[PDB]
Amino acid sequence: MPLITFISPDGSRKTYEAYDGETLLSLAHRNNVDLEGACEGSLACSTCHVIIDPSWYDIVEQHNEISDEENDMLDLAFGLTDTSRLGCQIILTKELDGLCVILPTETRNISFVKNS
């Protein structure tokens, strides 16, 4: 259960421990913050996809070639962000341990708080 640095469009930056393949939902619950969805998600996520900021997406996309089957995966990708690769609901992962990336949702906050 590493930590991920979420940067905001205003220049701010939030800090909240993320999980493996777990969405921000798991955080909204721990932070007892007004969330919307009520989706427990999952408790056991392994060998999940990868999700990195949109600044690295262009790098990993050019560093890795896509085959007839790979490139086809994009044609099926619907609703996913341009920052999430081989994903579905954009779920963070420990893979970003000690790395800075942009949050999946469109939320933002700068005020410091000591959640439970």
Automatic annotation (TrEMBL):
Keyword Iron-sulfur appears in the UniProt entry: yes
Cofactor field: [2Fe-2S] cluster
One GO MF term attached to the UniProt entry: 2 iron, 2 sulfur cluster binding
Pfam family, one: Fer2
Record InterPro entries: 2Fe-2S_ferredoxin-like_sf (IPR036010), 2Fe-2S_ferredoxin-type (IPR001041), Adrenodoxin-like (IPR001055), Adrenodoxin_Fe-S_BS (IPR018298), Beta-grasp_dom_sf (IPR012675)
Keyword Iron listed: yes
BP GO terms, sorted: P450-containing electron transport chain
Domain annotation 2Fe-2S ferredoxin-type: ranges: 2-107
Keywords annotated in UniProt: 2Fe-2S, Iron, Iron-sulfur, Metal-binding
Function comment: Ferredoxin are iron-sulfur proteins that transfer electrons in a wide variety of metabolic reactions.
Family from the record: Belongs to the adrenodoxin/putidaredoxin family.
Designated name of the protein: Adrenodoxin-like protein
Species this chain originates from: Ehrlichia chaffeensis (strain ATCC CRL-10679 / Arkansas)
Taxonomy of the source species: Bacteria, Pseudomonadati, Pseudomonadota, Alphaproteobacteria, Rickettsiales
